[PDB]
Design a protein around this ligand. Structure first.
Ligand SMILES: C[C@]12CC[C@@H]3c4ccc(OS(N)(=O)=O)cc4CC[C@H]3[C@@H]1CC(=O)N(Cc1cccnc1)C2=O
Ligand SMILES: [Cl-]
Ligand SMILES: [Zn+2]
Length: 258
């Protein structure tokens, strides 16, 4: 009986195996645009994905991860609210069964069709594993997806999903450029949070971009053809793999823009 997104193992059940689920800095959260305050202390955000090297794409039974080679300083995120350099290790999405839901973070309670998460770990901790034992071990860049025009840079990902339909399946996925998934503006909101799936560790500095990217209905529809189940098991479509907004508690969301 492992955790999942169903009625009997979903978000409302996670706290039993992972008590931190009711912690003080859980994610995602609703972003109240009117309460968010511009922060002058924020330095310019730097997203350097030019030397990014993807290696494989994997269906882990919860979502699909496009993994990168992080053995060297290539794709790095720095600046903004970040202290030091954070290295890109993988990215994935959260999406819904319908266009009206799917994102984890919400803006003034508005839910987007999906949300892209680019995961990075603080290089001063040596590795990914050590980083998740630190309050500032990770930095996740979140990008909302709305349904409209297709996102050309996403098609490569969409087309390989047929080869990793079920849990446990992986496929080579080299030379994918994550720069093709970024919106024009880097305006963002930031706050201290956690991983949004078990183990829900509170080691994340969240940077959520204000401008969403547009993806086509056809592209998101293919996301919904993936399976939560493994090969040879009853089919359960991989949809609504998002955690709802959690209590903001003692936190303030800062804006990078006036
Ligand atoms: C694989 C992992 C569990 C899942 C974690 C996880 C879960 C959801 C997730 O999605 S979201 N929305 O970005 O939060 C991202 C990650 C990235 C980190 C990853 C951990 C990376 C890691 O070193 N360890 C080992 C570990 C755990 C605790 C202390 N030291 C090392 C994990 O078990
Ligand atoms: Cl179900
Ligand atoms: Zn995520």
């Amino acid at each position: 009986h492992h955790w999942g997104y169903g009625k009997h193992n979903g978000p409302e059940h996670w706290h039993k195996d992972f008590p931190i689920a009711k912690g003080e800095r859980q994610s995602p959260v609703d972003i109240d645009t009117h309460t968010a305050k511009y922060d002058p202390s924020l330095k310019p955000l730097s997203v350097s994905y030019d030397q990014a090297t993807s290696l494989r794409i994997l269906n882990n039974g919860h979502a699909f991860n496009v993994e990168f080679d992080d053995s060297q300083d290539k794709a790095v995120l720095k600046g903004g609210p970040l202290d030091g350099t954070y290295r890109l290790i993988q990215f994935h999405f959260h999406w819904g069964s319908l266009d009206g839901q799917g994102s984890e973070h919400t803006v003034d309670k508005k839910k987007y069709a999906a949300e892209l998460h680019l995961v990075h770990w603080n290089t001063k901790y040596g590795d990914f594993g050590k980083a998740v034992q630190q309050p500032d071990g990770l930095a996740v860049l979140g990008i909302f997806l709305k349904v409209g025009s297709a996102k050309p840079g996403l098609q490569k990902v969409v087309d390989v999903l047929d080869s990793i339909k079920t849990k446990g399946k992986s496929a080579d996925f080299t030379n994918f450029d994550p720069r093709g998934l970024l919106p024009e503006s880097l305006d963002y909101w930031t706050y201290p949070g956690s991983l949004t799936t078990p183990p829900l560790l509170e080691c994340v500095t969240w940077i959520v971009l204000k401008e969403p990217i547009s993806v086509s209905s056809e592209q998101v529809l293919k996301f919904r053809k993936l399976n939560f189940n493994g090969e040879g098991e009853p089919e359960e479509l991989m949809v609504d793999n998002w955690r709802p907004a959690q209590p903001l508690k003692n936190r303030q969301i800062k804006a990078s823009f006036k």
